[PDB]
């Protein structure tokens, strides 16, 4: 199955580049601006999630940060 | 030598701690060792070999099915097994399917199969353990005097030849005094088993390809894996998980195969050093090292001559480098014995005085041939300034233009400094000679904080350690009671390790 | 006949709609149907047969180990693995030990051992599907009368003399009708699939004996088991649990045996009947049936003959049986033809007035034989009654005396009812006849309370189903209102069930 | 192991005697019995344990049996 | 019959390990979470047990867990 | 050496005491008495032998049935005794049994069955008895210094080579003093009778293998029992129990033999040692003992010995131990009379201060040889550090890094230290030298206090620990503030026992 945890958590860190830089930089934001882009939908409803937890500004913006950030993952 | 181009540069000043100066090493860049007491002296690192390495599992990249056979024993019954489940080597799932009527039994209810097939790999991906003992380095260091310019990277004279020595080291003998003929021996002590933070990489191949793989990644992956300890014939263990038998809902279970994934290990590995080998041995390059270097015995070579005629003519012009180094080609017609040059970088000439550091130590042209050269180089003052070589009315000049001064170098400087930091920590307090307190508790404060920051945080980089970085810095602007003191800072702590690029 | 001595007795007297009376039937008990105008009958279960069983699972009661091997690769290896763990059959275990230098390798810290053994089942235990198809019984019939008492139990001739069948009732077929030669036909229905609460139980050998299980125990026990569908040889699921393989601070891990368990399984069975077999068919002994006897055509063999001269004798005296009845044997030395036998239990002299039920139906000497002897049993009062035999002057009478009376009769009869709801719940509101109210709906409220009481409760049994019974009494006392209601009987719900014994 | 599940739970239940009924009786109880005159400890510290647990006589008094009772279990 | 008490009670100490060290850590737990898995029931009416004895909060909880765990077993 | 690699470590300070140093020893482990006064000695436990055993009881692993018969006497008349029951060695149950009619005999109510079977044990379980008298101890000790560390485990010479002593430690002589010839002889005293906690142990044998067993179990057990004493032919107690005669309601009162139990004993059998033997002497292992190690006569035999000239090449390169220390070999090429090897961990490279204990004491190598090899073994500090031997240009050097510093070593000791108080309890205040009143009151808080827990709680292990253990743990949160203080602490009491594993 899927498994293959990404070796980037334990990220061996020295001074000659490492294994993939530049799609590193990007791969973690690309698969959420397409993931929204096919459905805008969990936004839509993501407020009401929001607005309905923590009630307060940007302690109810957190909430509609994280959420339609946990929205396009899996885990 | 060795330096110039490489544009990762290091100057460390010393000649204090009676040559105690402690020098770090990064295959990427190099260190210069500028002191009064010596030739300056230009360090580098090369290739870190790794030998006698020894196989700790293995995988399987690219999965094979054989032989796909299946029975089964009608209603409730012991799912009847196959002779293929004796033998290991074979996938086998007992799952629970309907056989009603004419399936050929009554009670059309559930029944059970047993489907199995021969599991054979394709291909493999086999780790290798690397021990501290058994690893080496090496070092080659050169001098710049004044040797031909076009010589400024070799490896002919490796083991001859002016300023050019190889040395080696390996645990079992931290240290190594370079004999560099003529100039004295440079002693050189150098801790092989600390810096490069071995015994927690496995060194990884896939076909034709190589790695690093911090442990806990390599040890934790869901493919099959041989046992690694024996190579007559595979006796796997998992078996499972790059194969998929499946069903649908009718009377049978089929079985996939899942076409490799050798795309995925290569997709998976990611801040993983990429490695190269020759044979039973193989060359990282990543460069790490704590290197007490010795300045004790050097003798420059360049004392007790005359000065050179006058006969001075650039060759190729001169050039800017990088952290601001200027290098000069020169040619001296005279003929004379080996001698000395003048070298003196001018503010105008209301009075020809010294103006900036001059470092290529004594530049001293070696040969009876009449026509030489020599490449020394010198980092003149911020301002305009001239470069002048010899002392007579034959005497040649140019001028050369420095950009920026004092609080320009500051910076330039200082973010160097943090980029050692965000790349190393700890040891980046190696530079500094001596025992200096503000030296002495800088790793002491460093490594206690730092630990900890390497096990609270630490889980991943990039958009994962931004954003967590990110909020904290909110929690500065907000909250209310002091705590707000810690977090505020702790962003940019983590923001400046994602700032490293 | 086939009764008297079982003193497990159950009479049914409610002979009511056109011969409808239904009759719940235990191997242990036999019931007496009595129906005014019909000769008493007597069914008893006998052997309730399962034949063409099929194999499920199966396991080992005693286990053996062969060759035990193991192998190390020193710290930072996997742990090499034999080649016996290519063959399965053998267990193994990966486990970590210190082997520190003069082990043989240096990294004093901790390498691993893989240690095997063959694993060969010795005996065994294998469980048996027992399905209702092909599940039959036998009832044996037997009619009062007068036969010899000394044939009150035989079976040689079980379809010829006296008026003795021997009925088979197999799922297709849940109606026999046995033809008593002379006596008619007694109407029988039985339904098979119900009763006996199959397709639960699980038929199970240990050497050379027999059981029952329920199912959610023989399919849940930790022991090595093999698959059951294939005689050829084991190749096992489990067989860790009945092998330990264990260490002891040193180079060392060990492996044993643990010495069968075939002990444990008979100490663990608890609550499950024995069992026995002849072969590939085996003979439980648990009866339980739902028959509804349909006493239709019966014709009386006793009437339009005349009445036995005079001429009686006991033999052997008479004797109370059990629930009170008395049996009588008379000797009837008057030569005729098959005559008629008078007995009446009168209390008193004189006009000698019928009292109490005479249960043989009608007494029918059947010999020319000049000697002849007739089994007659009756039930009569408390009271100092007589047991009066003929009409003539050479009348003989027996002097016999009843214990109880009214109340006391009522209690006997008030235990065994409650008795039947203890180890029957359900069907055993099925000795009343035909459709009754209070009948139908008392299998109705039963069934539905009784399920959830099959499981909300229901447990274990003895001290685990007192306790829990005990304690809820205890809230009957204590506590407000409400459940002070209900609890207190729940208590008695259990503790009845407890009071079986 | 042991597990070996005990047979018990699910008692089938007609008029033939059970596999052991004699020793069915008593295998609870004689368990405990022994026990105790092996330990009287756990005994002495129970009412600790009770008197400091529900607090009314009763009430306060099952925990002295259920503990007392629990404490020659497996489970 | 059974009894057959378990040595566990007076378990010799040292630093060798004991006969069965891994089956004597599951053993006692492993009973219980099969014989719930037979009979959902025992629980299902505890709470009845539990919320009329003791009759608060924990000191309420603390049967529901001592009842379902005197069910499984001989005591 | 008989240490390194055992990885349970205890190292003890020396003892200004005049050699009072008191030890304990494990079966597991071995500790290491480092003394300036003495070279460092390495004691270890092996193997603590049992002899001179006498049998107590015995049991029936499996029971064997022989001729079942059986008489009844009818109603009124007692149980007919058959001849089998006066022979004893026949089991025989007289229970009550309808007898009806043509079962033979009038009065059908109840009669009296008597079976008998003959009882003879098959197998056996044999008791045997342990006394602190006829008790051994063996104690292998030997002495780091100069020595093949190929020869760190051997026992060919146990009376020879360089110092290696074997040491019989039996009540009648707790002390033995061993002479290692050279060094003088360690002065050892020991409490033979005391440590292991005999007279509560029953050595037992099952087939062809063994345990220990407390008191209190053995003798309390429900099996057939012979007395034990005699052998000549068994006359058993019991003899019911391992076999149960049952029977329905019918004529029928059957016997069965019920499998042996021999699964049972073991599944039986938990946190009981398993002890092998070897003819008439069991040897166990479990280590306890309070050994007062006299230090007094030790004479170092590295003392007036010149330095060992240049021509030292480690060899295996050097390793790191377990709890920190560092095992090194070297070759000295350069030979002479025993010559005095130098070993510093030096912190630096020029000036080489002494760092860290050097714990081999001396290391001497005595060969004439001209090649040899020396084992020398020491604990370097936390940070990066250089191993250093020789004192001629020649001298060779190592680098070696120690992980954790400070409160790092202390929680690793401060686990292991209550892992003391856990499996011993008391004696575990015995590392302590000489009388120190935190160390005379320690064992003296300790063994009231622990006797109180040894005997209130004390009922089990795991589940039964935990459970009983986490309830008081609530306790401490809730209740009052008075015994909150108490209960909340017994639980961590309780905890720490189940968290020993
Ligand atoms: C590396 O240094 C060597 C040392 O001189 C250079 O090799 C010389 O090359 C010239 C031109 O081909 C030959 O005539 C000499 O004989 C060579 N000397 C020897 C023996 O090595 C070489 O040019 C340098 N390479 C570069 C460009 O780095
Ligand atoms: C069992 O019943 C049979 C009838 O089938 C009896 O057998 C007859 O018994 C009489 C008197 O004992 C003999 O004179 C006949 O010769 C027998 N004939 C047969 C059928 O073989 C038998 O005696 C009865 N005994 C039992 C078991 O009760
Ligand atoms: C245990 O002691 C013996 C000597 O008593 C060592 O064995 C010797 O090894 C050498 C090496 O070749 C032989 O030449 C001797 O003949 C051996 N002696 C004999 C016959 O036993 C042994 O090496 C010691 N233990 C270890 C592992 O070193």
Same mark, same amino acid.
């Given at each position: ?75 | ?270 801040? $993983?050093? +990429? *490695?190269?080998?020759? /044979? &039973? !041995?193989?060359?990282?390059?990543? %460069? ?121 170098? $500051?910076? +330039? *400087?200082?973010?160097? /400094? &943090? !980029?050692?930091?965000?790349?190393? %920590? ?76």
């Amino acid at each position: 199955a899927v498994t293959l945890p990404s070796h980037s958590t334990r990220k061996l860190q020295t001074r000659s580049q490492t294994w993939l830089e530049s799609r590193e930089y990007t791969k973690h934001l690309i698969r959420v601006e397409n993931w929204i882009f096919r459905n805008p939908g969990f936004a839509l409803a993501a407020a009401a999630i929001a607005w309905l937890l923590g009630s307060s500004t940007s302690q109810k913006v957190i909430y509609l940060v994280m959420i339609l950030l946990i929205a396009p993952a899996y885990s | 030598i060795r330096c110039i181009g490489v544009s990762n540069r290091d100057f460390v000043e010393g000649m204090s701690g009676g040559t105690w100066v402690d020098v770090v090493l990064e295959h990427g860049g190099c260190v210069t060792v500028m002191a009064q007491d010596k030739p300056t002296v230009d360090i580098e690192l090369v290739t870190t070999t790794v030998s006698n390495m020894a196989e700790v599992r293995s995988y399987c990249y690219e999965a094979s099915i054989s032989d796909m056979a299946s029975d089964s024993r009608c209603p409730t019954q012991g799912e009847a097994y196959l002779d293929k489940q004796s033998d290991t080597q074979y996938v086998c799932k007992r799952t629970l399917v309907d056989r009603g009527w004419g399936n050929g039994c009554g009670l059309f209810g559930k029944g059970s199969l047993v489907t199995c097939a021969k599991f054979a790999c394709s291909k493999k991906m086999t780790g290798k353990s690397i021990q501290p003992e058994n690893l080496e380095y090496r070092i080659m260091l050169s001098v710049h005097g004044s040797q031909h310019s076009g010589m400024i990277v070799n490896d002919t004279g490796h083991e001859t030849d002016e300023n050019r020595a190889k040395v080696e080291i390996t645990p079992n003998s931290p240290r190594a005094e370079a004999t560099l003929g003529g100039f004295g021996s440079l002693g050189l002590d150098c801790e092989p088993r600390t810096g490069l933070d071995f015994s927690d990489l496995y060194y990884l191949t896939m076909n034709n390809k190589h790695w690093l793989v911090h442990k806990e990644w390599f040890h934790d992956i869901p493919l099959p894996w041989h046992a690694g300890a024996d190579t007559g014939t595979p006796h796997w263990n998992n078996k499972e998980a790059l194969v998929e038998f499946k069903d649908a809902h009718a009377k049978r279970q089929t079985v996939v195969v899942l076409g490799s994934q050798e795309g995925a290990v290569h997709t998976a590995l990611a801040g $993983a050093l +990429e *490695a190269e080998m020759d /044979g &039973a !041995k193989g060359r990282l390059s990543s %460069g790490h090292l704590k290197c007490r270097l010795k300045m004790d015995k050097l003798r420059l070579k360049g004392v007790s001559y005359s000065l050179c005629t006058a006969a001075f003519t650039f060759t190729k012009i001169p050039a800017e480098t990088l952290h601001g180094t200027v290098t000069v080609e020169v040619q001296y017609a005279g003929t004379d014995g080996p001698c000395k040059v003048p070298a003196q970088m001018a503010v105008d000439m209301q009075t020809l005085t010294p103006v900036g550091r001059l470092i290529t130590a004594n530049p001293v042209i070696t040969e009876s041939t009449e026509n030489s050269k020599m490449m020394l180089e010198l980092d003149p003052p911020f301002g305009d300034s001239y470069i002048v070589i010899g002392v007579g009315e034959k005497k040649i000049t140019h001028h050369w233009h420095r950009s920026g001064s004092t609080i320009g170098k $500051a910076f +330039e *400087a200082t973010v160097r /400094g &943090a !980029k050692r930091m965000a790349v190393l %920590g700890d040891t980046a307090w190696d530079f500094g000679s001596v025992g200096g307190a503000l030296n002495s508790l800088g790793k002491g404060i460093h490594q206690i904080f730092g630990a900890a920051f390497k096990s609270l945080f630490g889980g991943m980089s990039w958009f994962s350690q931004i954003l967590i970085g990110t909020l904290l810095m909110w929690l500065g602007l907000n909250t209310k009671n002091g705590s707000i003191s810690l977090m505020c800072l702790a962003l940019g702590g983590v923001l400046i390790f994602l700032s490293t690029a």
